[PDB]
């Protein structure tokens, strides 16, 4: 027979009960496969409701330590002339190169961001990188 009450339980809970009660003479083909390897969440219908008052989503903004460097670099120099190639997974941009050198100089033991930022730019200039400031 079957049960079309898609809002009451799941397809398995409904099917299992009807097979047990004897309404369904033969269990469906997928029944045995479902029971052996069930999903992580049982597919039960649930109604979405609006968040009211102080309820907020638990999704958090993804930030990293180097975002402080990236934000500063983009403000000082702007978008590098080299165009971002997002197709290449190993592509390194001028900003990424700056972060890398900045981090390398941080390992040396520099504690001043401004001084460390200045030293980072100087190292890149020596390597032949073109750093045209917005000014």
């Amino acid at each position: 027979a079957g049960s079309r009450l898609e809002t009451v339980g799941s397809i398995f809970s409904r099917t299992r009960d009807l097979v047990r009660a004897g309404v369904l003479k033969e269990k469906p083909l997928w029944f045995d496969v479902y029971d052996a390897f069930p999903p992580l969440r049982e597919p039960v219908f649930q109604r979405p409701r609006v968040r009211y008052g102080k309820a907020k989503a638990p999704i958090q903004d993804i930030w990293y330590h180097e975002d402080r460097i990236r934000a500063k670099f983009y403000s000082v120099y702007g978008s590098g002339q080299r165009a971002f190639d997002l197709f290449n997974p190993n592509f390194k941009s001028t900003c990424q190169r700056f972060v890398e050198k900045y981090t390398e100089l941080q390992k040396l033991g520099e504690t001043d961001e401004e001084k460390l930022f200045v030293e980072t730019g100087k190292a890149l200039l020596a390597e032949g990188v073109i750093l045209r400031r917005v000014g």
Partner: protein, 86 residues
Amino acid sequence: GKATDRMDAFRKAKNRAVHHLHYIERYEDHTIFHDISLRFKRTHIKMKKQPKGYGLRCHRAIITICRLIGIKDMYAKVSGSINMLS
């Protein structure tokens, strides 16, 4: 079931009800597991678990539905609106 003729209404409702079957858990196949108190819209139904031999002491419509489910012993009080659909 809806139809101009009463026979067509009887048939439609009867055949369609079979595709919308619940499964009711009966304690020892004669009563409910625990007392159920609920409000559907404006209808209040308060069902109580009862021992064997108590019988069906509830609203007549509930008696009919209980016999179809297989519940033998239960008490229920219907308050608020006595709408048959609710």
